[PDB]
Amino acid sequence: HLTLEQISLFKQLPGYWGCKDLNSVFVYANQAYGELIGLKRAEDCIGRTDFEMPSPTAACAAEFQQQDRYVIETGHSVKVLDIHPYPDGHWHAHIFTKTPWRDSQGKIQGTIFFGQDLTHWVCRATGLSTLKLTARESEVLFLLLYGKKPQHIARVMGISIKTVEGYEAKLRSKFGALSKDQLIDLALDRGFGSVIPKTLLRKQLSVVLSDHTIP
Amino acid sequence: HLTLEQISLFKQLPGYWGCKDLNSVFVYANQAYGELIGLKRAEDCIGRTDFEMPSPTAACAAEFQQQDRYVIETGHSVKVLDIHPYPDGHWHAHIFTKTPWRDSQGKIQGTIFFGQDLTDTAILEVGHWVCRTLKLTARESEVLFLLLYGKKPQHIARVMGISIKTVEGYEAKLRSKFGALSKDQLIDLALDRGFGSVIPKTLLRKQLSVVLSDHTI
Numbered sequence: 260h261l262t263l264e265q266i267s268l269f270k271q272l273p274g275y276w277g278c279k280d281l282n283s284v285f286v287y288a289n290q291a292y293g294e295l296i297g298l299k300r301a302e303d304c305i306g307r308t309d310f311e312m313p314s315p316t317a318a319c320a321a322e323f324q325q326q327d328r329y330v331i332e333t334g335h336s337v338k339v340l341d342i343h344p345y346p347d348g349h350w351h352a353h354i355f356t357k358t359p360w361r362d363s364q365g366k367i368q369g370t371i372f373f374g375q376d377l378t379h380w381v382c383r384a385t386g387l388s389t390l391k392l393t394a395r396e397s398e399v400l401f402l403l404l405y406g407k408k409p410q411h412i413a414r415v416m417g418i419s420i421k422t423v424e425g426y427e428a429k430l431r432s433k434f435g436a437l438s439k440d441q442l443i444d445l446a447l448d449r450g451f452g453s454v455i456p457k458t459l460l461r462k463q464l465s466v467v468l469s470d471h472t473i474p
Numbered sequence: 475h476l477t478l479e480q481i482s483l484f485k486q487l488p489g490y491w492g493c494k495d496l497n498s499v500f501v502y503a504n505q506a507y508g509e510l511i512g513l514k515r516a517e518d519c520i521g522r523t524d525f526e527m528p529s530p531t532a533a534c535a536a537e538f539q540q541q542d543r544y545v546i547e548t549g550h551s552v553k554v555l556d557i558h559p560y561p562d563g564h565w566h567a568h569i570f571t572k573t574p575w576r577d578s579q580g581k582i583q584g585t586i587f588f589g590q591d592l593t594d595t596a597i598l599e600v601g602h603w604v605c606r607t608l609k610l611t612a613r614e615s616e617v618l619f620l621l622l623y624g625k626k627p628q629h630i631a632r633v634m635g636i637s638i639k640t641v642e643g644y645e646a647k648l649r650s651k652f653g654a655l656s657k658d659q660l661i662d663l664a665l666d667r668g669f670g671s672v673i674p675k676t677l678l679r680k681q682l683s684v685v686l687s688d689h690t691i
């Protein structure tokens with residue numbers, strides 16, 4: 260049994276978090292998440308789905324559920340880049356971690372979500388050492404660097420697949436790469452993975468980002 | 475008071491986290507942090523300090539406690555890059571965020587700590603990247619990085635397992651390579667060139683606790 264002292268940690272652990280059941284119906288949300296999502300008491304999340312929150316995030320409720328079902332059917336954990344206008348009238352950006360929620364004998368009974376606010380050197384063989392992209396180009400590049408395929412990028416940005424190939428070709432040539440693989444390596448070796456394009460921060464989207472341990 | 479579902483969620487939330495009192499005595503640690511730190515029964519953390527965990531991390535316990543005291547005294551949140559050997563026999567890198575812990579009436583009674591495994595998305599959150607004509611060697615980039623984040627020469631020596639004189643050597647090699655005339659101008663030029671977002675890849679197997687950012691809330 261937990262002391263009240265330890266329960267205050269439960270109440271004050273920073274971030275935007277909670278859990279849903281197998282139908283992605285909310286079971287708990289901490290106060291920070293409830294306020295974010297437009298509610299004065301986070302208890303009003305319980306029993307509702309992502310479609311039913313008074314918040315523009317509900318326009319991506321179908322993406323949230325597909326994410327949730329992936330964690331549930333596979334047991335893998337995912338990292339989601341979430342960028343949305345919110346009931347407070349501001350755009351926010353988060354990485355939401357999603358992991359399976361397990362019961363007392365270990366079986367998956369839902370998902371846990373945990374969100375955090377998102378607030379010219381070259382790599383050499385050993386060490387480091389020492390081109391102007393379009394808004395559209397830098398958006399396509401950022402998504403390609405995190406493992407997203409062209410049909411993924413077409414959906415996120417709301418353009419045709421052929422158009423993503425258009426921007427991919429410019430990038431490949433702007434970096435002087437002879438293939439998409441070389442484009443990725445060259446861009447990574449120049450710090451392109453560590454910056455979110457500022458125009459991407461005003462495009463509503465929910466996309467899983469490929470994630471790897473370092474090293 | 476908590477329901478069975480809220481207790482279950484509390485026990486499965488990701489990360490390696492817990493809280494400490496005003497003297498950084500542990501009051502709670504989740505299972506993930508217990509296991510990482512060598513205490514498979516995580517309530518064994520309670521009432522210990524960082525000096526008393528069964529873990530090579532304790533060599534940096536004085537630095538952990540200086541970070542905790544900063545959060546307590548200022549009310550700021552800090553993010554720390556933490557690289558250490560661990561009782562499982564491996565090196566682990568993490569970002570640890572430290573937040574004031576407050577009582578029923580709002581005053582600070584300690585700190586909350588929350589660690590993430592160093593991953594692609596995790597470094598993105600802190601705006602740094604890792605490498606998988608002005609040229610820097612492996613050891614020079616390590617020195618330069620530790621210089622950018624406030625480490626004194628004797629601290630740098632400890633991280634790199636060498637002597638201060640050796641460290642002075644690399645520091646002068648960087649001052650002439652950047653054309654800077656002092657350590658001040660060297661930090662300024664390297665920052666001006668965007669070295670403030672690089673973590674040299676060879677630091678992932680050297681022991682260090684380094685504050686990356688400090689935030690008002």
Ligand SMILES: Cc1c[nH]c(=O)c(C)n1
Binds near residue numbers: 372
């Ligand atoms: C804002 C947000 C994104 N994805 C989610 O699943 C949840 C619960 N909230």
Ligand SMILES: Cc1c[nH]c(=O)c(C)n1
Binds near residue numbers: 524531538570587
């Ligand atoms: C491993 C580790 C790093 N820094 C800390 O303060 C804590 C609580 N643990």
